[PDB]
Design a protein around this ligand. Structure first.
Ligand SMILES: Nc1ncnc2c1ncn2[C@@H]1O[C@H](COP(=O)(O)OP(=O)(O)OP(=O)(O)O)[C@@H](O)[C@H]1O
Ligand SMILES: Nc1ncnc2c1ncn2[C@@H]1O[C@H](COP(=O)(O)OP(=O)(O)OP(=O)(O)O)[C@@H](O)[C@H]1O
Ligand SMILES: [Ca+2]
Ligand SMILES: [Ca+2]
Lengths: 169, 342, 274, 134, 399, 208, 166
């Protein structure tokens, strides 16, 4: 079957029913500081190529909702990164993409409202907003060094594919 | 004239209740469906599932509102309405072949079942053991009994069989009725006594019928002939050979006018002249798939819906085509300015 | 396909793949094949002594001695020369190809290998076409039993060579259908006045049972001379299998007709349903 | 013990319950009175004889008359018969079909066409229904 | 067996395997198609079959067989005309014939076949073997198998749909058969898309040709997708292969990089969802499902002998991957029970003759004396009729 | 005994055929007579098993352990007892009147014909299924002949059938035609004219 | 000139004979058999009749209360016609289950036989069945002539193709 995150800790935090998982990042956001050499973003990028072909994904825990989200976002990055023409130019569209306000759980336009819980109030809304942007910024950064050799056709080839047939857009 | 299709498969047999508000039909099945009329539509209201073989006959006792059925499964069941459901009561007929036809006696105290066992089972109810018992009329039946019809006196019974004969028997059951008054057919009527037997020796007798007062019995044979014998002219028999296919069902509509239908797929009229003692063709009653008749297959049953066999105003036909037609004598008379009844 | 092909596809392709590989430098694959041909012919392709660099093609004809009594060996040696070696026990003619020593143009040998059977039949016809061209009359006729119960007779005359076939019709009916095909061969000159004359009997053998048919082909110098000799041999030695083949294809055709008429009938019957 | 068809001796089985004047027919036939030949040749049929010979004889007499007629004179003859006559002709027309010889079936098919028109399919039915026939 | 070997013919939806009994491989493997013009004279004879019937300018190509069953008898009967007189070159009256059939083949189709073989070609004998039983006979050639048996689960995957067929003592448990909407064509179709979204220069009219080549020349089944995906990105040079083809029009060479599709292609057997929306069940589960449906008393014999047949089962490690995944499903299920039974031996046999397992099994049986005894003869056909071909007594195991 | 009590009797020979075995239980004065009570090794399952083998020769390969309950359905719905085997084999061989469609649990349709009467024929010809014996009908004959001459006629006029395996359409008629045969040979030693007097009717009541 | 009259007599005879009705067996308990086949109750069998065109072509019609057997003697002018007719009739009889009114074997003395039962006349307009038998008689005559020509037509091309290659 598909690949599920194994970062779910007995004491991991939650922002909605998504898992507020640590990330080794420098961008601002409520993500806990990460010690270990790998986080939910490295797990997402490592599982992408495989998982992207799947249509049915069983949410085992809240860590999977965070994983799903990142997998969907990577597809977004490829669409843009594809039309780029240098690792430096790619780094630009990556910041610009990370900033844009993509829809979030509970809004018209978000792909999995039946699976992701909606922010219960204005604070959760702001926290979640910020956690997603932090993930996006860091995702797009680490993903930008992979995709570039010249954006490798071995990543560009996925632009047309959608995890579970969904799209953050 | 008025045709209605209940299905495309055969309607093996039918029976209307007292009011002609409901009709039971066998859709070529092991079961019986009862339809009731609502406005200008037919609505199915019941399903009698009990026979474990095709139903061959159905008769509805008017006053007691009891339906009786017989089938190839060798059984017969009496149906009684308990609230909103019909419950069946098994009747041991003691036959080893399929039942073929059945008719309630006019007094509703007993019914008769014709079978392939070459016998007629006369059944009646004994309210001292709570069960239906029967007596068999055996001699001189040599083949399967295709049709039956009671005399208005609930004692004499007409029967047609594959041995080519139309007979009249006494079906007198002392335990439910009084000794019958004399009749031109004879004065002695002990159970099983053969009152009359046609002489012809060819053609299966598909249908038999007594007139309103019962002094005349008519039957139709496979050799495309129709006959009438009246006890008043010393049982003389008038005979008419047809130019068309065999008739399968017949009924009087007045003392001297018959209506029959069969493999030609349409009803016809026959009239009898007492003085001359001769039968005459009265004409086709259904004058205009691939056919120019209402029914698209053989008409196997006909029955009077109103006016009795003495002055019928409307009659019904059901056929192998699944259709049921209601004919109005009065209308038929207008539509056909040169028609002559009685 | 109306005319039956003269070459054996199994032989040709078995060889072509082997030469293609030998020529490419690959290590030889082992080969072991048994197969047949019309007239009770059995072939065998294999690696003698398991030496995969050597491929042998052998043929077995139950009537070989009769062909041999009419120049078969001499003719076969002319065509195959050194590829022809001592016959494999159980067979009559064996061809041997050293994969490590093939010619520049192979197809020439691949094509000739494919006609092995035909070349075994060749000499008997060249012998009599020869007689006729040298007016050597009186010579004994050749009798070749190409089947357990069918026979071919070849006799040369002053200006014509005759080939008479004694073929069998297994089914009692197949004889009739055969009379129809022969009747047409019989009047073929009405379509090809120069083509060979065909005579046919039904039980009675010519001057040269219920199921025996004698077909006689009269060949003229324009058919047996050195220039039309080969095409003529390619046609006459297949005649019998040509006739039986077409009789069967005739029955197959009638089946498609019967399938059509029956299907049509079934359509009408069902339209008779309410 | 199963080879004996016991049903043969069953007492519940069913059991069922002569000819024209040769000269008389030739008289009408010779004197041109065809219609009279027909009616005479259909007089007193061998319906109660067990001998198939006396029956075939009557068949021959009728068949002789049937062939003697002229295509254009058949309808006239057929129409002269009473329904019972038409019935009887039918049985004969059908009996003749059983012995085709010298194109007799050609004339019997013409007579059939006229008898049918006169008696209707019912006359055919009564041919199938007979328990004792010509 | 007399002087000549019998003819063995296995007609499949995509390819027909024909040859003579005794041989190890078929003498001809040709597309099961026939090209006709599109009937007076001999126009019924103007047709070609196999490859010679695929690209014929003036001829309409047809496929007489759908889902392994003959859909057009006219066309099928002619196909046999050339199979016998053109390719095999056998006098049909001198050779017994062995034909094959799919399990869902009706006894009616069997009589239609016998009518054609006896009425048209006059063969001296005919036997119609079930494809699954032949696959099991062919596996006997395998090392993994010690004693001959005709009880086993057969996985037949060719070109149409794949079938999980259970067989007990020679007869198929037809009521327990299961099909899988994934086969040779589906895999090529999937590899084709993987090539469109990445490689360039591929001649449009040769897309399927290239996908099918790559499928049979570079594909295989891997144990894990991410690890596999990682081996490629971590070393590229050792996992990215090169396929060059011939531009049919430019008559020139065009090369593309062969990558992920190598293992993603066969994967659809285990993750159908990758390419088929209407089907999600992994093959290992269907095999498990079929076996659990069979009588208890024969489930272990079935698990112990999962034989392969068909070109689509030729992918490297297919058997290994099937045995692993099936051992897990049965191991887990057997664990829950214990929580709330002797371990079940799951064994998937693989051999060299798989690409043509049926034909091979048929060739081996038709070379034995028993085959000639169980074969229905011409005398039998004449006296009893085509119904004697309804039942073809199984043979080969008991002795 | 209980069976006979249902039809208001005390004396008579009962033929009970179920799923496992068929018995012929004579009863006199209200109590069974074990000294005559014989047993027939063939019954329900056997006939179902036999139907499976017959359907195999027709091209239908059912699995004895997997489809046993399916064939039983077929057997109960389409099988019956021939009255005259010769006549039955003529209908199967020369026509399609006996052919009936039957849908299997998976949707596939099969045609069943002559095997409809051939399967139940085991009850009368045990050798068809490799079982030595005489056949339900003939067994019945002996049990009543090897008994009290005075109570022999009484038994013959009181044979009752019970058990699901006695529901085959035609069974009663086949027994009667078979008893008359044995009675005409092994008793009347040949003279047909005395056959008529031999009274015998088998009660095949509606229930049980 | 003699076909039309012949088919008109056959048609009238079928219409008269195809007047059937469901009949449970009076001989065998709960059985139901085409009486014209088992013939176990003489009173249920009608009189066998024949309609002949000539000494060769004819039709035999056997009726009973629930079934009718019809046997046709086809026209066969020569040997090739005889074997063609025999193959076609055999072709159809082998397929009698799809041809539900066909007999697997004809009555001795005929080429093909029908068995029309009450069940057939129940779910199929009898006049349509009558039509079919008449249509069948004509159509098989034609198809046979088309087969005869085909064999001859193809025989000629086959003889020419071979001969013209020398
Ligand atoms: N080496 C290979 N690896 C993977 N697939 C292969 C290989 N060789 C052939 N195939 C595929 O096998 C399939 C054909 O197999 P096969 O001949 O068994 O099927 P078939 O019998 O013609 O059709 P079917 O069995 O579905 O009715 C084709 O899809 C072909 O591409
Ligand atoms: N209509 C039928 N026709 C023939 N056989 C039937 C019919 N109905 C049921 N059977 C068979 O009868 C058998 C079951 O009968 P029954 O219930 O009397 O057996 P049982 O009493 O449970 O066992 P036993 O009588 O052998 O001790 C089964 O073989 C069943 O298939
Ligand atoms: Ca296959
Ligand atoms: Ca019991």
């Amino acid at each position: 079957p598909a690949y599920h995150s194994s970062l779910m800790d007995p004491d991991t935090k939650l922002i909605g029913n998504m898992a507020l998982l640590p990330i080794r990042s420098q961008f601002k956001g409520p993500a806990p500081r990460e010690t270990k050499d790998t986080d939910i973003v490295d797990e997402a990028i490592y599982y992408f190529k495989a998982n992207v072909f799947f249509k049915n994904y069983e949410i085992k825990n809240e860590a999977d909702r965070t994983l799903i989200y990142i997998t969907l976002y990577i597809s977004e990055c490829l669409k843009k990164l594809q039309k780029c023409n240098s690792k430096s130019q790619g780094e630009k569209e990556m910041y610009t993409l990370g900033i844009t306000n993509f829809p979030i759980p509970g809004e018209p336009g978000f792909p999995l409202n039946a699976i992701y819980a909606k922010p219960a109030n204005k604070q959760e809304d702001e926290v979640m907003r910020a956690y997603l942007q932090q993930l996006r910024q860091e995702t797009g950064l680490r993903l930008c060094e992979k995709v570039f050799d010249k954006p490798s056709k071995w990543w560009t080839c996925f632009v047309k594919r959608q995890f579970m047939n969904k799209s953050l857009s | 004239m008025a045709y209605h299709s209940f299905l495309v498969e055969p309607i093996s047999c039918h029976a209307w209740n007292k009011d002609r508000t409901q009709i039971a039909i066998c859709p070529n099945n092991h079961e019986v469906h009862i339809y009731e009329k609502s406005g200008n539509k037919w609505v199915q209201v019941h399903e009698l599932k009990e026979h474990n073989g095709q139903v061959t006959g159905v008769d509805w006792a008017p006053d007691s509102n009891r339906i009786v059925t017989c089938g190839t499964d060798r059984n017969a069941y009496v149906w009684t309405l308990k609230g909103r459901t019909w419950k069946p009561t098994l009747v041991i007929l003691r036959i080893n072949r399929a039942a073929r036809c059945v008719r309630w006696a006019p007094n509703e105290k007993k019914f008769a079942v014709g079978s392939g066992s070459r016998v007629i089972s006369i059944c009646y109810f004994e309210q001292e053991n709570d069960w239906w018992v029967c007596k068999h009329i055996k001699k001189p039946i040599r083949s399967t009994v295709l049709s039956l019809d009671w005399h208005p006196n609930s004692v004499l019974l007409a029967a047609g069989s594959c041995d080519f004969k139309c007979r009249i028997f006494s079906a007198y059951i002392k335990e439910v009725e009084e000794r019958p008054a004399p009749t031109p057919w004879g004065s002695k009527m002990p159970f099983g006594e053969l009152m009359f037997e046609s002489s012809s020796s060819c053609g299966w007798v598909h249908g038999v019928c007594f007139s309103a007062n019962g002094s005349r019995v008519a039957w139709v044979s496979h050799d495309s002939t129709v006959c009438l014998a009246d006890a008043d002219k010393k049982m003389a028999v008038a005979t008419l050979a047809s130019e068309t296919l065999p008739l399968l069902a017949v009924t009087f509509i007045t003392e001297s006018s018959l209506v029959a239908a069969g493999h030609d797929c349409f009803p016809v009229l026959f009239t009898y002249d007492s003085a001359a003692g001769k039968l005459s063709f009265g004409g086709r009653l259904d004058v205009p798939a691939g056919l120019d008749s209402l029914h698209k297959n053989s008409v196997s049953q006909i029955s009077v819906l109103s006016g009795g066999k003495a002055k019928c105003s409307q009659f019904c036909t059901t056929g192998m085509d699944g259709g049921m037609s209601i004919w109005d004598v009065r209308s038929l008379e207008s539509a056909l300015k040169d028609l002559k009844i009685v | 396909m109306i005319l039956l092909e003269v070459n054996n596809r199994i032989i040709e392709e078995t060889l072509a793949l082997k030469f293609e590989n030998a020529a490419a430098g690959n290590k030889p694959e082992a080969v072991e094949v048994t197969f047949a041909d019309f007239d009770g012919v059995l072939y065998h392709i294999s690696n003698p002594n398991g030496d995969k660099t050597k491929v042998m093609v052998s043929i077995s004809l139950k009537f070989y001695k009769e062909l041999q009594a009419h120049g078969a060996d001499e003719l076969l040696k002319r065509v195959y020369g050194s590829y022809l070696v001592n016959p494999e026990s159980g067979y009559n003619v064996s061809l041997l190809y050293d994969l490590e020593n093939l010619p520049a143009s192979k197809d020439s040998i691949v094509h000739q290998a494919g006609m092995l059977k035909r070349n075994c039949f060749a000499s008997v016809f060249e012998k009599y076409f020869q007689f006729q061209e040298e007016g050597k009359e009186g010579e004994n006729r050749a009798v070749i039993h190409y089947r357990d119960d069918e026979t071919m007779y070849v006799e040369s005359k002053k200006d014509r060579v005759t080939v008479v076939f004694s073929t069998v019709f297994k089914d009692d009916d197949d004889v009739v259908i055969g009379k129809v095909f022969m009747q047409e061969f019989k009047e073929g000159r009405r379509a090809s006045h120069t083509a060979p004359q065909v005579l046919f009997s039904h039980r009675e053998p010519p001057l040269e049972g219920d199921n025996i048919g004698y077909i006689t082909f009269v060949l003229f110098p324009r058919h047996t001379n050195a220039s039309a000799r080969d095409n003529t041999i390619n046609l006459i030695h297949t005649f019998r299998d040509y006739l039986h083949y077409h009789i069967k294809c005739s029955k197959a055709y009638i089946h498609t007709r019967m399938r059509a008429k029956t299907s049509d009938f079934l359509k009408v019957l069902n339209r008779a349903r309410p | 013990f199963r080879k004996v068809d016991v049903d043969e001796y069953d007492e519940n089985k069913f059991v069922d319950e002569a000819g024209p004047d040769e000269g008389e027919v030739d008289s009408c036939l010779r004197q041109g009175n065809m219609t009279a030949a027909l009616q005479a040749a259909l007089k007193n049929p061998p319906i109660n004889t067990k001998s198939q010979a006396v029956k075939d004889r009557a068949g021959s007499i009728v068949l002789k008359v049937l062939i003697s007629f002229k295509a254009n004179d058949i309808e006239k003859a057929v129409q002269s018969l009473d329904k019972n006559g038409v019935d009887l002709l039918m049985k004969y027309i059908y009996k003749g079909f059983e012995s085709p010889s010298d194109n007799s079936s050609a004339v019997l098919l013409q007579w059939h066409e006229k008898a049918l028109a006169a008696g209707g399919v019912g006359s055919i039915v009564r041919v199938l229904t007979a328990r004792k026939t010509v | 067996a007399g002087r000549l070997p019998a003819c063995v013919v296995d007609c499949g939806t995509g390819y027909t395997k024909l040859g003579y009994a005794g041989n190890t491989e078929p003498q001809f493997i040709i597309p099961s198609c026939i090209a006709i013009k599109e009937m007076k004279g001999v126009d019924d004879l103007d047709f070609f079959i196999g490859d010679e019937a695929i690209e014929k300018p003036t001829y309409a190509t047809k496929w007489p067989i759908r889902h392994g069953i003959v859909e057009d008898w006219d066309l099928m009967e002619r196909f046999m005309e050339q199979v016998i007189f053109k390719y095999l070159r056998a006098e049909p009256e001198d050779h017994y014939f062995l034909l094959t059939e799919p399990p869902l083949n009706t006894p009616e189709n069997r009589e239609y076949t016998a009518e054609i073989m006896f009425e048209s070609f006059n063969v001296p004998g005919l036997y119609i073997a079930v494809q699954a039983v032949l696959a099991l006979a062919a596996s006997w050639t395998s090392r993994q198998v010690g004693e001959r048996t005709l009880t086993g689960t057969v996985i037949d995957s060719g070109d149409g749909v794949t079938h999980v067929i259970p067989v007990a003592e020679g007869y198929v448990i037809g009521s327990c058969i299961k099909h899988i909407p994934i086969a040779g064509r589906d895999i090529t179709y999937f590899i084709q898309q993987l090539l469109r979204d990445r490689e360039v220069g591929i001649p449009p009219e040769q897309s399927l040709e290239t996908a099918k080549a790559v499928k049979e020349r570079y594909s295989y089944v891997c144990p894990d997708l991410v690890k596999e995906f990682n081996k490629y990105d971590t070393d590229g040079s050792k996992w990215i292969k090169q396929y060059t083809g011939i531009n049919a029009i430019s008559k020139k060479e065009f090369s593309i990089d062969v990558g992920y599709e190598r293992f993603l292609g066969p994967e659809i057997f285990f993750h159908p969802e990758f390419a088929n929306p209407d089907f999600t069940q992994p093959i290992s589960e269907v095999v498990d499902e079929v076996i659990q449906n069979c009588p208890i008393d024969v489930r272990r014999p079935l698990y112990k002998n999962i034989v392969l047949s068909g070109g689509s089962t030729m992918f490297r490690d297919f058997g290994r991957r099937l045995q692993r995944d099936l051992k897990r499903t049965v191991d887990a299920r057997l664990k829950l029970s214990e929580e709330l039974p002797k371990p079940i031996d799951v064994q998937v046999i693989t051999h060299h003759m798989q690409r043509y397992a049926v034909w091979f099994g048929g060739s081996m049986l038709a070379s034995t004396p028993e085959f000639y005894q169980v074969c229905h003869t011409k005398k039998d056909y004449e006296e009893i009729g085509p119904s004697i071909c309804r039942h073809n007594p199984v043979f080969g195991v008991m002795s | 005994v209980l069976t006979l009590y249902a039809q208001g009797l005390l004396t008579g020979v009962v033929v009970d055929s179920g799923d496992g075995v068929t018995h012929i239980c004579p009863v006199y004065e209200g109590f069974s007579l074990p000294h005559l009570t014989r047993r027939l090794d063939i019954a329900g399952r056997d006939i179902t098993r036999y139907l499976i083998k017959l359907l195999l020769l027709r091209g239908y390969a059912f699995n004895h352990s997997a489809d046993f309950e399916t064939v039983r359905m077929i057997k109960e719905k389409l099988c019956y007892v021939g009255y005259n085997i010769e006549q039955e084999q003529k209908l199967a061989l020369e026509t399609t009147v006996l052919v009936e469609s039957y849908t299997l649990p998976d949707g596939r349709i099969i045609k069943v014909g002559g095997e409809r009467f051939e399967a139940p024929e085991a009850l009368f010809q045990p050798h068809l299924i490799n079982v030595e014996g005489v056949g339900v009908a003939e067994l019945l004959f002996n049990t009543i002949q090897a008994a009290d001459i005075d109570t022999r006629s009484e038994f013959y006029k009181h044979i009752v059938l019970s058990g699901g395996s006695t529901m085959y359409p035609g069974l009663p008629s086949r027994l009667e035609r078979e008893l008359k045969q044995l009675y005409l040979e092994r008793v009347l030693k040949g003279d047909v004219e005395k056959l008529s007097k031999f009274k015998i009717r088998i009660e095949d009541p509606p229930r049980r | 000139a003699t076909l039309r009259p012949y088919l008109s007599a056959v048609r009238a005879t079928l219409q008269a004979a195809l007047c059937l009705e469901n009949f449970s067996s009076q001989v065998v308990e709960r059985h139901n058999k085409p009486e014209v086949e088992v013939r176990s109750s003489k009173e249920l069998l009608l009189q066998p009749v024949t309609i002949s065109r000539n000494e060769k072509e004819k039709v035999l019609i056997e009726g009973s209360i629930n079934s009718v057997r019809v046997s046709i003697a086809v026209k066969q002018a020569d040997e090739i016609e005889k074997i063609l007719c025999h193959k076609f009739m055999r072709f159809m009889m082998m397929r009698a289950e799809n041809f539900f009114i066909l007999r697997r074997k004809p009555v001795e003395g005929y080429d093909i036989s029908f068995l029309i039962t009450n069940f057939h006349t129940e779910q199929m307009y009898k006049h349509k069945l009558v039509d079919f038998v008449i249509h069948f008689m004509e159509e098989i005559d034609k198809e046979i002539s088309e087969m005869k020509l085909s064999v001859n037509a193809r025989a000629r091309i086959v003889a020419e193709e071979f001969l013209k290659n020398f």
